Design a protein around this ligand. Sequence first.
Ligand SMILES: [K+]
Ligand SMILES: [Mg+2]
Ligand SMILES: [Mg+2]
Ligand SMILES: [Mg+2]
Ligand SMILES: [Mg+2]
Ligand SMILES: [Mg+2]
Ligand SMILES: [Mg+2]
Ligand SMILES: [Mg+2]
Ligand SMILES: [Mg+2]
Ligand SMILES: [Mg+2]
Ligand SMILES: [Mg+2]
Ligand SMILES: [Mg+2]
Ligand SMILES: [Mg+2]
Lengths: 84, 94, 56, 136
Amino acid sequence: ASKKGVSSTKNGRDSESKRLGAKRADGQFVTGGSILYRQRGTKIYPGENVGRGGDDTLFAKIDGVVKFERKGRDKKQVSVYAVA
Amino acid sequence: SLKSIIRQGKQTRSDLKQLRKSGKVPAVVYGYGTKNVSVKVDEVEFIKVIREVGRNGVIELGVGSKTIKVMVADYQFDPLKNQITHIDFLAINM
Amino acid sequence: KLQITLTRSVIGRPETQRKTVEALGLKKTNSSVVVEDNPAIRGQINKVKHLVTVEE
Amino acid sequence: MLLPKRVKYRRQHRPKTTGRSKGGNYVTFGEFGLQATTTSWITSRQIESARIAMTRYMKRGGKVWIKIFPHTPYTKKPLEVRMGAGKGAVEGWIAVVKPGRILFEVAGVSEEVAREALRLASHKLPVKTKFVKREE
RNA sequence: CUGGUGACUAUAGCAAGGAGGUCACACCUGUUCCCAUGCCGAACACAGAAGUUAAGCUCCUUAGCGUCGAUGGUAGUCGAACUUACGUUCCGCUAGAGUAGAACGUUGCCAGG
RNA sequence: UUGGCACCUCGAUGUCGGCUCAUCGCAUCCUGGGGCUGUAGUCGGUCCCAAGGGUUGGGCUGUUCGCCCAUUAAAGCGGUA
RNA sequence: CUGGGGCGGUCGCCUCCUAAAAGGUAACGGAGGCGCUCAAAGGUUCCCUCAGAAUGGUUGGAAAUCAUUCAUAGAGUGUAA
RNA sequence: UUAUUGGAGGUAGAGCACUGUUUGGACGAGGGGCCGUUACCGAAUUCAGACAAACUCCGAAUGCCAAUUAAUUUAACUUGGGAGUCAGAACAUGGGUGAUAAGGUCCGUGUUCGAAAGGGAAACAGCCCAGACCACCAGCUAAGGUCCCAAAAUAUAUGUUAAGUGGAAAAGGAUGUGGCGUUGCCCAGACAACUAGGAUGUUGGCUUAGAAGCAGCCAUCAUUUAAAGAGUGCGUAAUAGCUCACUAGUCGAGUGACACUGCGCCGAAAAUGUACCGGGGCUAAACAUAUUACCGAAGCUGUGGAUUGUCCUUUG
Ligand SMILES: [K+]
Ligand SMILES: [Mg+2]
Ligand SMILES: [Mg+2]
Ligand SMILES: [Mg+2]
Ligand SMILES: [Mg+2]
Ligand SMILES: [Mg+2]
Ligand SMILES: [Mg+2]
Ligand SMILES: [Mg+2]
Ligand SMILES: [Mg+2]
Ligand SMILES: [Mg+2]
Ligand SMILES: [Mg+2]
Ligand SMILES: [Mg+2]
Ligand SMILES: [Mg+2]
């Protein structure tokens, strides 16, 4: 049976997905050090008691409740506040 | 240069569809001297009134007991059906 | 008080709807429960209303 | 033969064809228009055929506007090849048309001439159409 | 009322027109001193008080731009029923655009008036 | 037809052409009946109805095809592993 | 590996889209990068703000350097997105 | 699981503010052929209108993560003993690929099969209904049905269809038929038919061999009219000739156009045999909209029985 020659694709590559995004919910209690948000750049900024790691990961510095908040007109941040 | 309408309540999608099938046009009256009012008009009568008074003419809209002098602020149209689908009445100040 | 009866089967229905049928306390087809009316119950009913019959 | 002078991507996902016409549903340049009532891809070759038909009937008296443009390349595999081994090469260019879109408009002629010209045009197209005027 | 310093998604902005000065803020006068310019006392820094509201700055007017923005309707859509129709029907949710309209900021603390 | 797919069959579903024997479809090659014709006649062109019957011997080539010689009313096109 | 196998192509890592607004998600689906570089292109303190355009100006032109104005990011961010 | 509340995120839609794509105008910073002004105006600007998986000034429904959270429900997790599984399939839907091919292929979501018997779909794993512990010559229902095969309506009311459409298909074609609207003319006589006229400048001008209403271009005007086109078709080489438009008369009541819709018609040709309702048959026993019955499963209920749990509780 007749069979034609086929070409090749130069595509077929992709990197591993990095599981970015929110790691804890607004209103959730977290312990100090818990990662809050994985990101490239500052899509979300560190707020109160929140640090920004070398790769922009947002993390809690204290035990407390996570709160995602507006930051100005276009930006936002995430904060952690100690519970009473 | 007059036409009467009827107040509406809270209407489902089927309610609006049945209105348009019956041949009435939903509309909203708003502007000076009035609160927003949701109304039904009759499409044929509205077309006659618009032909008489022009696109920018003033219409005397019977809204319940009251009568309001309004202008057609805008309208939504269905060109596949050649059917006026919605109307906005702007009660103009005097 | 609401009398709720499972009038259609859960066979062939999504697992989420089956979970709601279970949470309402219904077991077999044509089984019934008597529950206190409130928004939570009404929400469960609304989720599975194509499967159940409600009597006040 | 219409086609973009260039595109960023030559190999594109084929467009969605369900739904209604997003825009261009009114005659806006001329007096009369040809309104689609069914859905189809419309090729540059079909556009050109319809344009020539209507303009030749109008005998250069009036003005014609093509309201749709074939932005989208579509590919096709080479003859008698098996599945796989990458996407095929660009075959042509199409405009997606859904009910309500005005395909062509005409001005500067009588309504009767416009009707006959747009009838001749519509017979070249893979969609059902209707003669439409400017609304007011 | 003025100033300093905060809070708030520009409803706070821009633009245009107009008013203001012993207090204060500036422009402004200088380069001895600390300090400074890849050159420049322009700037930064310092010393100072002859002149000016010209500009900044503050205040007032507005709706041209920017900002905000309904109601009503439409698109889309969860679920259900019917369906293979580039679908239909019912229910809930409900845009974007646009329209009316809002708006030439609102406020905390401190020191002076 | 050339393919695409890989669903039956790999503890076997024999594969081209010819011969023998056919059988069916009609989208009709001839014969039958019609319409139109840029159908004078004799001939033709094109389309419609029609499947009853009929639809050839040779040269070359494994060939099917195809070309050729000589006929015929005609030397139909396909399906049936 | 492979829409049978051979032949062709590919094999690890990064970015985007496909991906159905959490995350994840395939095909020999659509596009590109990497196997380094920097002794500062690192740390810290202080200071600063672009690209482009218009108008003037000598060698100097459409673009060199100088000046004013406008210019909200259209610049830059070593190297793909 | 639901309710309420908060939050992350950029899809559907939408839009054009960015990156690209693109259609018509307007105008042109500026120079050239041009004297100032009749290319290019490639620039820029500007008005309006469109396109996008890898565009976004915007932005859902859902889904997702949570809550000193309420209601209903019955799981959940840890550790250890034993596994099997690593060929999946259809259907529906969101997508890629392919050709908006495949009972194709590859991902997302759901159901069913696998591993599911029973009823429906003629027969038919994957569709629709529904999950068989056992027995009954009891009852109610589901999907689907109720003229006969074959259980139950030759049911009730109002319509549509004439095509066996129902019981296979498109662009397109058509005085099929029903409904709802708009609108022209008309007893100051409409539409059709019949009687008569249908003329003059003039064979309009050009072109052509010829072109005289009637090959093709330019016009498309005037006079008598009770009206008649520089002419609607046939005809001629061109004329001629016939005819229409238009008008008057006869007659006497309706007549034409358009838009949106329901149901039908043609387009429609394959091979063993009717053979594209399961059959007979059907003009309803088809279709649409309502209403009341009934049939219909291993679903549910009734009665008795088995086993294993739970709870009262010796008993049962
Ligand atoms: K067509
Ligand atoms: Mg397979
Ligand atoms: Mg065997
Ligand atoms: Mg035949
Ligand atoms: Mg025969
Ligand atoms: Mg294969
Ligand atoms: Mg995601
Ligand atoms: Mg979209
Ligand atoms: Mg699946
Ligand atoms: Mg098995
Ligand atoms: Mg019964
Ligand atoms: Mg019987
Ligand atoms: Mg049972």
